[PDB]
Amino acid sequence: TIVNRIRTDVVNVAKSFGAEYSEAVIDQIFQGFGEKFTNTGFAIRVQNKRNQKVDCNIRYGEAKENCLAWDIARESGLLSDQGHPVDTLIQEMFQAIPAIAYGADFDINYGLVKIWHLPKIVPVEEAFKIPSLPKSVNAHIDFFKKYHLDALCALTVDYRNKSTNLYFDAHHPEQRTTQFYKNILQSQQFEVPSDEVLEILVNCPEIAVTFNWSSPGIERMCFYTAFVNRETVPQHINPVLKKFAQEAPALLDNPGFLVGWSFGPKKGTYIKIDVDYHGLVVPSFFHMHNL
Ligand SMILES: [C-]#[N+][C@@H]1[C@H]2c3c[nH]c4cccc(c34)C(C)(C)[C@H]2C[C@@H](Cl)[C@]1(C)C=C
Ligand SMILES: CC(C)=CCSP(=O)(O)OP(=O)(O)O
């Protein structure tokens, strides 16, 4: 079956990258969501957030107007009340902005970590009405204006990290210059990467900005780029990129990949790479950003 091949592949990725994982967690996740993994946008992700440690996430998305993952996770025990503003945030999101899709994200050592809300691209003003957003979001209106973060293409609630992301379509001509990325990164006193990475960033069609309830500032920013096959991933930039690009499983032989470049302060400066397991994610990425 597809679901058994997926579960096998996930375990094999975790063992190959030495990622911490829990067989009991994986059993819970697949009990609730394995059927969903078989026939929707499904990806396996690895990242090097923590020092000398690779983490493995699995995630899916589908074009439903309601947030089915929330009901499944509540019923299957994968999401309990946190005693925290995240408890109702996703509900508020789907009440405040109409969704064309939703998604969910799982750390295979923990369980459900995030749920995504995917609207049609809307002005970012539509998010300022969401009551339980961290106050730092409204406090950053002038920042969003200045860096042409006006076109909101997704929202996410990170239940484990207790944080939220806003995702923007990087449509503005200024975002085709390396100076834009140097300036938005320096504005947060984040690390500025090499010129190589900068000329990769200028092609990023999407920018994520992370907020939380523990600071007035931005926690980290992420620039996302897709690659149509293993060969065009910039494997030389980092060993995790090379190893995952050459080894990641998929249902076709040469799958595409989504690469996120994260930047923070002792920070979240790191790489994320996801494999387009079924082949739907990468085209939907280009389509949602009109490329
Ligand atoms: C299918 N789908 C999902 C989609 C998604 C959820 N949140 C997003 C925020 C920005 C962009 C995207 C998403 C897409 C459309 C590029 C997409 C990515 C893949 Cl990796 C995911 C997570 C499924 C495994
Ligand atoms: C397009 C990408 C692959 C999904 C967007 S959500 P994310 O996984 O990048 O969010 P975080 O890394 O948890 O901040």
From Swiss-Prot:
Family annotation (InterPro entries): Aro_prenylTrfase, Prenyltransferase_CloQ, PrenylTrfase-like_sf
Pfam family of the protein (one): PTase_Orf2
A GO molecular-function descriptor: prenyltransferase activity
Enzyme Commission number, as recorded: 2.5.1.159
Annotated catalysed reactions: hapalindole G + dimethylallyl diphosphate = ambiguine A + diphosphate; hapalindole U + dimethylallyl diphosphate + H(+) = ambiguine H + diphosphate
Effect listed in the UniProt record for changing residue 116 to Y: Retains 94% of activity with hapalindole U as substrate and 74% with hapalindole A
Binding site for dimethylallyl diphosphate: 45, 59, 114, 165, 167, 220, 224, 272
Protein keywords: Prenyltransferase, Transferase
Family membership: Belongs to the aromatic prenyltransferase family.
Protein name (Swiss-Prot/TrEMBL): Hapalindole dimethylallyltransferase
Organism: Fischerella ambigua (strain UTEX 1903)
Gene expressing this chain: ambP3
